[PDB]
Nucleic acid binder design. Structure first.
Ligand SMILES: [Zn+2]
Lengths: 151, 364, 94, 49, 61
RNA sequence: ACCGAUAGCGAACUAGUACCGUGAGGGAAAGCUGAAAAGCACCCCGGGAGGGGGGUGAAAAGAGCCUGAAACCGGGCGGCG
RNA sequence: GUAAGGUCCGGUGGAGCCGCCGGUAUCGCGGAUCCUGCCGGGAGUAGCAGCGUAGUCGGGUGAGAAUCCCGACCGCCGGAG
RNA sequence: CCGACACAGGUGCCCCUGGGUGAGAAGCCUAAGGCGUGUCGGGGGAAACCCGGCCGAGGGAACUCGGCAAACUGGCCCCGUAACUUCGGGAGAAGGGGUGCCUGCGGGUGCGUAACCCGCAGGUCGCAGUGACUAGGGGGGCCCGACUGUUUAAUAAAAA
RNA sequence: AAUAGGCGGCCGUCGAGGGCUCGGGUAGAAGACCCGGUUGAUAGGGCGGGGAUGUAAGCGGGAAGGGUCAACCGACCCGCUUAGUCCGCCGCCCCUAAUCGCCCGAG
């Protein structure tokens, strides 16, 4: 995957980055992106740091089966996707670098578009009772992000 | 019907859910002619036993018998509000209420910790722990003007009832600082007299000795001890399944027939047990103490607190009541008492009985 | 508090965690409790537990850690890497 | 590297179980540097093993 | 018995080994002949008309 | 006047090959960059995989390479909520 | 155009395609517990217990250490591991 | 290695095994040798409920198709031992008493105050002395088959 | 309770009132709930009270005897000793930690 789903990208005012074939949960990636959308880059990085440190739960709105609630208001199911947070943090650092190279003030960068997709699946099998072999697969994730220097 | 047995448990206490508030509510009040506050509040202290000469009717009349007692400590209540009720379309409605302005607190047990002088507490500072938003720039003139307006409405006749708003004083017994606010009804048949009683007692302290009568029956309201989630065997007392059962023994056998094609609400199930709102009737008031001491024969006074202190509780320091029997709730629980709403035809005389022994030995 | 340089004595009540854990994890749970207690009370970002105190905790096997442990705590400031100042506590027997 | 070959060869040379071989915890670099049976014997003589 | 535990006794001498004539692993070793080409039992090859195996070799089926 | 890569011989290709059964025997899947590799020099970041600039090409058609549908999933937009 | 369906406009694509007359056919998809390929809800759920419940503290390598290496302590098998 | 597997099965436990207790290649502890890979970890009075264990006052099978499961007894020394009988047995029938440690003697084989085993007297502690581990519950009628043995590998072990 | 209630107070047209974070349970499967948070006895530590077992180690003496009837060995007993150990109970003392900090929030 190379293309982005953003329509009106402007190279003069915007920067973009992506990651492909990440070996993380696409569901949790979608959930984290939903929360990161619309935030400033620094705020998003601090958000991810808190999630990684387990100081801040991520709410679950779509994939939340058999998930317990968390202390405070708005919870409701939540969890701490550390691996997803780490990968997305690396992508955010990459896009920050792209903006800096283009010559955009890093303190005014707002995440205008961020999305996650399901990529290719790596197949595997696991043995089970009664001589049956059963699917045992990894689902990879694509991440895309484009930030804009607001004014 | 082949074999018949009474149902397991009572359906009259459903839902068996956690109590709405940890502070018990009183839905009904006794009907009395004497102008006095109908009830009191206190904190559970513990249990002991006494030996006394029985006086109520029965075979054991005039004989020495064993009786367990629950001691509950009762620091005086602060009467700080008056509320008026008019008659609405569907029931009573609150016409208005008025509370006294802030005053210095003269019973706060402050200690001169090194650095800074004594804190110099005042009311509206212990109360904000419960209300959290109290009147600002409130003065005696406006308080008196509001009281006069309330009296004027009473004279006009739109006020059908009046109640007194009181707050506990845990800081006196050094149990905690956050107070508890309740409202109590008053006895009598004239709203004007009830209002005058409350007005005379506004802003003052009230003690058990001034309201409750020794030897009379009461009803005790509190929230029982919490047990958490419990299975049907303990929650409803069902029968254990046969020992050969390979799918468990502490569960109900069948949860319903084929028709109706639904699980009925009357089938025993697991759920919350304990921490329920409950009322127990006809608990006799054996004695009322003062300052943690009980006077027996006007010549020897004994300290109610057992040796080593009450388990899980401190030392009784204020007025306390000795109720005959057991009361719902845990140690330190807030417990309310009201004059008996449903006494028997034949009841014990209203007076302290003859006590021959009080157990003050170590209870731990 | 404890500034860098001086030593203090603490009495860790390991007994507070005996019943909240299965009997056969009490020793490692006690080591973790000691680490948390020392870090919290000394305001140290890191704690270094001596093998001697570890052996004292493990003396009677994995099931019977001592109920109370008297330890010596010495605090220092490293200020390494420039990430503020890091406080390191050292725990020794008695 | 993983100190496996050195431990096995030292046990063989000393005629004892591998669990009875002691390696100086503060000379791991030297022990790993040793690659031959001659080097292992030299370390044994020095007392590192 | 008769299932998983039975297959653990396959550590004895193999029934069939390589055949010098046809090169297939079908030489019954204990009896001394090939179950595919008949080596050690006949001079001529073991060929049957109901069998398509010898046609599969030369893609002539 | 045969089929046009689930078709046509099982095999358009390292196919009677891989693989299954002790054995007799059974037996697949899998074609396509571009006219020309001109198959991305150099720069920033990342542990790396890769990402962003900048180049090549009529067109990335970028080797996971002609066209690129449906089912499914992520985002934006219009309506309901 | 009643219809089976035909034709036109905007976009992608990069080399073949159709109207009419007359013939020919492996000629028309919703089902066969149909066949082949791909993807959904179940689901970030079960499982990663039971027959031997084993790790902890300092140091080391390393971008990265509950899981790798060295020392001590504590344990399992010890007619079998 | 075989069973589709880094399968709790099978093949191969095929050959071999220091010290204490002890009749013992039993159980328990431990030396040598091996392992922490019968390879996911962390939290918790953090419940209900389920699997595997320990104890339960008073009664003692009133439960159940049926004492199913559990429980009683349990090693060793001495006394004592029924109906019946194919005279061999039943039989360890049944039932009763003792058992630790310490201080001194006697005895058997022995050259020996080497080693192994067998009795005797005295003092003494505990609720309990085969103190853990190991370690039978018993008796009386009836039916069937004489006994040891074999059987439906994967619901029948039996009077077949 | 779709007639989706009454009342006193506080705020808005910067801001009352909250959540996370902290020390603990009158509570608890996650959530929720309750008390405390320097306006302090919430937890730990020290001291004191009350408890459960049942008289610690060490030293001194006796002990059925044996021993060269000497030195020494000896199960067990007596005194210091209501001892020693321990406390998921209570009281007093700020000695330690209840800190720094972050985010909704009507208009
Ligand atoms: Zn052959």
């Amino acid at each position: 995957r190379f293309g982005y789903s953003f329509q009106n990208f402007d190279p003069k005012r915007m920067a973009r980055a992506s990651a492909r074939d990440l070996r993380i949960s696409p569901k949790l990636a979608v959930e984290v992106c939903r929360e990161l959308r619309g935030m400033m880059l620094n705020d998003a990085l601090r958000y991810l740091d808190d999630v990684i440190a387990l100081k801040r739960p991520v709410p679950l709105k779509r994939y939340n089966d058999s998930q317990g609630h968390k202390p405070g208001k708005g919870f409701g199911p939540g969890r701490y996707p550390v691996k997803v947070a780490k990968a997305i943090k690396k992508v955010l650092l990459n896009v920050k670098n792209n903006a800096v190279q283009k010559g955009l003030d890093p303190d005014k960068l707002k995440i205008i578009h961020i999305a996650a997709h399901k990529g290719p699946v790596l197949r595997g099998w696991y043995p089970r009772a009664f001589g049956r072999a059963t699917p045992f697969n990894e689902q990879t994730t694509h991440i895309e992000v484009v930030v804009e220097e607001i004014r | 019907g082949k074999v018949h047995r009474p149902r397991r448990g009572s359906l009259g206490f459903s839902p068996r859910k956690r109590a709405k508030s940890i502070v018990p509510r009183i839905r009904s009040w006794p009907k009395e002619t004497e102008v006095r506050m109908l009830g009191f509040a206190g904190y559970k202290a513990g249990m002991t036993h006494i030996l006394m000469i029985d006086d109520e009717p029965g075979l054991t009349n005039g004989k020495e018998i064993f009786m367990p007692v629950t001691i509950i400590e009762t620091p005086p209540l602060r009467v700080f509000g008056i509320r008026a009720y008019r008659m609405g379309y569907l029931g009573l409605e609150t016409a208005t209420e008025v509370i006294v302005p802030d005053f210095p607190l003269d019973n706060y047990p402050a200690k001169e910790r090194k650095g800074k002088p004594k804190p110099k507490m005042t009311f509206y500072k212990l109360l904000e722990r419960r209300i959290a938003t109290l009147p600002k720039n409130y003065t005696q003139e406006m308080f008196e003007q509001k009281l006069g307006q309330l009296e004027d409405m009473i004279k006009e006749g739109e006020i059908v009832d009046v109640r007194a708003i009181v707050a506990t004083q845990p800081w006196v017994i050094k149990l905690k600082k956050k107070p508890e606010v309740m409202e109590y009804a008053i006895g009598g048949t004239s709203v004007e007299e009830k209002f005058n009683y409350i007005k005379e007692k506004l802003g003052k302290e009230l003690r058990v000795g001034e309201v409750l009568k020794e030897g009379e029956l009461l009803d005790v309201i509190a929230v029982t001890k919490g047990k958490g989630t419990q299975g049907p065997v303990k929650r409803w007392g069902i029968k254990l399944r046969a020992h050969k059962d390979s799918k468990g023994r502490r569960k109900v056998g069948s949860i319903g027939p084929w028709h109706p094609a639904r699980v009925m609400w009357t089938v025993p199930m697991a759920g919350q047990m304990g921490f329920h709102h409950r009322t127990e009737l006809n608990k006799r008031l054996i004695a009322i103490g003062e300052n943690g001491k009980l006077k027996l024969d006007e010549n020897t006074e004994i300290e109610i607190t057992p040796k080593g202190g009450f388990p899980h509780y401190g030392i009784v320091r204020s007025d306390f009541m000795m109720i005959a029997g057991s009361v719902p709730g845990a140690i330190k629980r807030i417990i309310r008492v009201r004059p008996a709403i449903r006494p028997p035809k034949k009841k014990p005389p209203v007076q302290r009985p003859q006590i021959t022994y009080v157990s003050v030995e170590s209870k731990q | 508090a404890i500034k860098a340089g001086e030593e203090v004595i603490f009495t860790v009540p390991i007994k507070k965690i005996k019943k909240i854990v299965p009997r056969w994890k009490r020793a490692p749970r006690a080591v973790k409790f000691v680490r948390e207690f020392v870090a919290r009370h000394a305001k140290a970002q890191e704690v270094i537990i001596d093998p001697k105190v570890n052996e004292k905790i493990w003396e009677r096997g994995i099931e019977k850690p001592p109920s109370k442990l008297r330890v010596k705590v010495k605090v220092e400031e490293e200020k390494r890497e420039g990430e503020e100042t890091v406080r390191i506590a050292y725990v020794t027997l008695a | 590297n993983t100190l496996k070959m050195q431990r096995r060869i030292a046990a063989e040379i000393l005629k004892c179980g591998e669990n009875r071989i002691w390696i100086d915890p503060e000379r791991i670099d030297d022990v790993a540097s040793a690659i031959t049976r001659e080097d292992i014997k030299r370390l044994i003589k020095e007392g590192v093993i | 018995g008769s299932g998983t535990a039975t297959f653990g006794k396959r550590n004895s001498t193999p029934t069939h080994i390589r055949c010098r004539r046809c090169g297939r692993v079908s030489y019954n070793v204990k009896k001394g002949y090939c179950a595919a080409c008949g080596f050690g039992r006949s001079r001529r090859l073991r060929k049957y008309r109901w069998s398509k195996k010898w046609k599969k070799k030369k893609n002539a089926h």
